[PDB]
Amino acid sequence: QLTPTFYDNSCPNVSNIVRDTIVNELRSDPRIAASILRLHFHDCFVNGCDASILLDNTTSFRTEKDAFGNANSARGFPVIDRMKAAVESACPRTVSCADLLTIAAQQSVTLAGGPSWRVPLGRRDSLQAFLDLANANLPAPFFTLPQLKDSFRNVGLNRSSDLVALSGGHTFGKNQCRFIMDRLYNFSNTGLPDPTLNTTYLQTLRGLCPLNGNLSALVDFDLRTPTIFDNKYYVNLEEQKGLIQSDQELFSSPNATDTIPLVRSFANSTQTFFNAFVEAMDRMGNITPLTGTQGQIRLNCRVVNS
């Protein structure tokens, strides 16, 4: 069983070291908090939160960093290396990379103005990476609501609240033009933009992402508060201003009978959202963890111990 007090004796200063690292990095890179939260999400959705995503290539297995959902998208790996080194210095061979990334995600959320809570700990590090599993398990922005629900249920999160609350991670961070080009100019081969995208916002997005333009250009997930972790993400959905297809579907999909009330509830109350986010975050962080003597306490998050 994972417990929040796992390192209270072996490394009581772990959370503080992680926090300090993120604060320092945020000065030069204001996007790092969002990036780190996403790393934890992509870790947990592939064989569980076992730091498998942090492993680099080996001749026996490919890195998950080359998965379609990670390649030229996932970022912040050096920052994780930095805090790991700092933690290793303070508490040698004690904190697993899986736990380190979980704490980093929570601290990132709190630093961005979100809720503060102690995450369950005790996770251990994987002995391999899973590229094929990452390609199969990570959801895509073009997924329909039924597909989004399928993706979450596939890894163990059955509740619509899990999906709606965790999607709130898009209250900050960036998104490449490539992922919304269809919504802007030719959605589902209709030759027309996605009708669920507010027409005024459509104009703004087309200006940021012109046809035949730089597909790698970045746009903010939350037009209201781009870098602040708050419930504004849901207010946007209510106005048909969700950035990617998977965001807006939570409110506009024909299959959204169960998700619409959740979107409204979170848009109406920061407290309701924050409570649900913490609840969902801990549930995601409890996905098939290696514990006890299973796996290792990786010393270098990029490679398995030898």
Ligand code: HEM
């Ligand atoms: C429900 C399905 C989800 C889909 C399809 C999805 C899709 C995406 C896409 C397309 C990007 C843009 C990547 C890029 O342009 O490089 C992204 C970024 C991001 N996602 Fe999601 N996401 C989902 C769920 C989540 C969840 C559960 C969290 C965390 C709780 C999360 C947190 C983030 C963050 C913070 C970013 C910004 C990262 C950065 O700016 O570096 N996402 N997501």
Ligand SMILES: [Ca+2]
């Ligand atoms: Ca993993």
Ligand SMILES: [Ca+2]
């Ligand atoms: Ca926000």
